[PDB]
Amino acid sequence: QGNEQSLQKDLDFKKAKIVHLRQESDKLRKSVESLRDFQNKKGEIELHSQLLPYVKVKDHKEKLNIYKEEYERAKANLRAILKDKKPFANTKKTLENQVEELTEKCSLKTDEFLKAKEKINEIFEKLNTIRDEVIKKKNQNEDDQIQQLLLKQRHLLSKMASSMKSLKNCQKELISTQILQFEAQNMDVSMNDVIGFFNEREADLKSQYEDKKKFVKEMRDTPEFQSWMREIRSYDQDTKEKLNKVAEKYEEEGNFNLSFVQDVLDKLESEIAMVNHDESAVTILDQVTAELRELEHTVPQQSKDLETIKAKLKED
Amino acid sequence: DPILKRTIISKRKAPSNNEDEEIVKTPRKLVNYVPLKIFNLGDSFDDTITTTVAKLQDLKKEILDSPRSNKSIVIT
Amino acid sequence: NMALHLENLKSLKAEYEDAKKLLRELNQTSDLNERKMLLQAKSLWIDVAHNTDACKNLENEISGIQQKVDEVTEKIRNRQEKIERYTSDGTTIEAQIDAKVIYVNEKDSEHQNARELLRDVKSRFEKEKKIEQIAQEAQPIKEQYDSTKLALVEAQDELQQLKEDINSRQSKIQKYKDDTIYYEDKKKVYLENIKKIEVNVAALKEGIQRQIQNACAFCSKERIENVDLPDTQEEIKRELDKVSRMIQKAEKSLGLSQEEVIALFEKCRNKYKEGQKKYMEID
Amino acid sequence: NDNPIPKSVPLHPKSGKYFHNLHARDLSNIYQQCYKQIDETINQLVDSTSPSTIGIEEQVADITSTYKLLSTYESESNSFDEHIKDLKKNFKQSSDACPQIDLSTWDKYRTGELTAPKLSELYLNMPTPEPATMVNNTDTLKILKVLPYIWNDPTCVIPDLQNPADEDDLQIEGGKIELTCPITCKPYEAPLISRKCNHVFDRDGIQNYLQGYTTRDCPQAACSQVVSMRDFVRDPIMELRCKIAKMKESQ
User: Fold this and answer.
1) Segment holding C14, helix H or strand E
2) Domain count, chain D
3) How many domains does chain A contain in total?
4) Across the interface, which of C119, C242, C253 has its CB nearest the CB of A272?
């Protein structure tokens, strides 16, 4: 009976151990499949790194494209304007031609303005002496030389009446002329400023063109650009088309994935959480397979031992 | 030069119709000095609640600094 | 009564010992939690640094434009100050023409004197048929006639000179008023530019205050400088996500929420003191 | 047309000096000078004609025509001066209303999208200088309007300065004017006239009826007012009529 107290309780305890080890058997299967999922990164990370991630290679490609298409706008706008100065140079030439027109015009109308003043004044000289002559003659009272003397004033007054004729046209013409000139002069000033305004715009476009050229040059030969055949030459001793093993599945996960924008952050973190709890009882597989089997076999063994024990008990 | 890698990579492009300006560009306003940039990146989880974790950080030590269990030593 | 009450004591004591075990895990929980707070503090500080850099840029540009308006105001001041002097010259010079009109008319009158005297003196050359008295008394005055006549030219030429001078002075002086109006328009546009611009200073300052106060709410605005972390918000976000997922895994592995467990832990621990006081009462 | 040259651009203050410099010369000096001349060529012929001289009406008519031409000349010359001033005034208004150009907006105007004033045309059609706003009458012609008939015979009141023929149509109402006063038989030299009284006394002695009081009635009779000697002024008719009397009261 003491032998029974020993065998049955030990049989219960080892069965408790069997169920406890079963509680970790599923955990170890989970650990194995979890390690396989963990190694899935061996394919995933290496593949989008071997074929450097699209957010890098295609990102460089697209930014290079947008920079390239930016390359031509400044220079295109520049082609016409840089040579448009020659038309502007010719316009300035026309304006200085109108300046020469101003010079000659103003000069000759000033000349007729002097002509009018002289024609009135200098001819006024003889208009003056009429009275001196008539009074001189009259002072000889003491026979009839008075008539021809009294005739002069009529023709003299007619002469001066006719003289004032020009005055008017002369006066008006000059200003009319001057104003025309002024307007042109005015136009002239505007243009000189305009060239400057344009020239500043031209300098801006030239600077922008040089700047975008700098960005074009730097956009290539970048460390990642210099990395061509390095993210690809990590196979320094296995470049034999043997990589096709991942070809179809990675192609499905790629071009036809409908999503390729730093999608690594979906699994690169989840792998950390799952891998953070593992490697526990990894080598406890043998006990859960052979030692457990031996224990559960000695279950019938000592079960029949107890059969014979209680049979002797009945024999009492 | 293996075909598959470059097959995976792409170089075809469409620089023909795309333009930097859809029709025209809006010129910079003489007072176009809008400060902007009041906040760029963040707002993952609320942080005032994280201040609560900061408080628990020393609450744990404060509670540790006290009589704790196995004090059944009373007699007579 | 005595032993019956000694059981409720011990069972609850074991329950409290269980809560302390949970707190032991919560210790590492918090030790790893602090990382997210540190990362967020770093991000906020770098954002504030860039914001203050922007505000300094705004201050520099507004200072530059204000300096330009200062040069413009100097341009207005020096000019206008000159124009009072030119206007004074133009309004006082009228005295010259007012005093020259009388000058010219008196010159014409003194020439009229010779005009009248010449014929009178020359009327002594008549038909009569030491005799120098025939002409000598008038010959000097007869030649003086031209000396008197040139008075009219030397007066009228000067009067025309004054006319053109007054016209030119008045015109070119009054049209400095257009210069004044144009420069004043420039002053107004620049001033309204300043009025539309400066408001940005308050717009950015209210923010600066908001973020600095938010950082100060975490009882740290200077010390996190010692923390090692990339100076890029995007990368800081990636580290934040990594630590956050690690914390979520740690939280859900224990199967219990730290603060909620601690809440029950406080009362459970207090149960120890409560039970003890009444068992001393048993005494 | 089909060129970068635009029709015009609004005024630029840089050369605004030139805008204001636009200013027409003035002729008032020449006008007054020729007025003085024409006023000369009329005194001498009052006494230098011969006793047998008969007929100077055509002479005076020609002189009047010449003076009328000169009066037109000065009147519209002024008119041009004021209109020239108004031209530059209107141009200043337009400039004030002009959307001044700057930076690269000059091309946008060269597209012809917006216009700018052009004083050249605004002057080609300046405010119509039609002859108006003149009421011309001067002593210089008060003398011409009367000297022909006076020369015919000084002792005759042809002009009543009311209706061309006379004030009265069918009556002898009025009065023949005798110049030398009987109170002072001596000849006059340069007396003065009050327009309302239409009378003069002598170069000196216009203070005749003053004893304590400084004014009294019209010289002879038929008057309703006392004289105001501060209104006395030069009159040409006095010497105009005395010259022929002095010349003829001989032989």
Assistant:
1) helix C3-92
2) 2
3) 2
4) C242
Round to the nearest angstrom and report the end-to-end CA distance of chain D. Answer: 86
Query: Is D156 marked within a binding site?
Result: no
Q: For residue D16, what is the nearest residue in chain C, using CA coordinates?
A: C175
How many separate helices (H) and strands (E) can be counted in chain A? 7, 0
Are D76 and D196 within one domain?
no
For residues A236 and A223, membership in a common domain is answered with no
Count the Cβ atoms, other than its own, within 10 Å of residue C250. 19
Q: Do residues A170 and A295 both lie within one domain? A: no
Q: Nearest chain D Cα to C165, which residue?
A: D21
- Same domain membership, residue A299 and residue A168: no
The reply to whether D115 and D68 lie within a common domain is yes
Of C170, C163, C168, A118, nearest in space to D26 by CA: C163
Min CA distance, C146 vs chain A (Å)? 14
Select from B30, B53, B62 the residue whose CB has the most chain C CBs within 10 Å, as the one to mutate to test that interface.
B53
Listed in sequence order, the DSSP H helices in D40-144 are 57-97, 105-110, 119-124, 139-142
- D233 three-state secondary structure: strand
Strand partners for D226: D217
B69 CB neighbours in chain C (<8 A) are 13, 16-17, 20, 272
Closest by Cβ to A73, choosing from B13, B15, B20: B20
User: For residue C80, what are its two tokens?
Assistant: 């206008």
Q: Print the domain residue range for D195.
A: 181-234
CB < 8 Å to B71, chain C: 272, 276
Among D234, D230, D209, D204, smallest CA distance to D219 is for D209
Q: How far is CA B17 from the centre of its chain?
A: 37
Using CA atoms, how far apart are residues D21 and C15, in angstroms rounded to an integer? 108
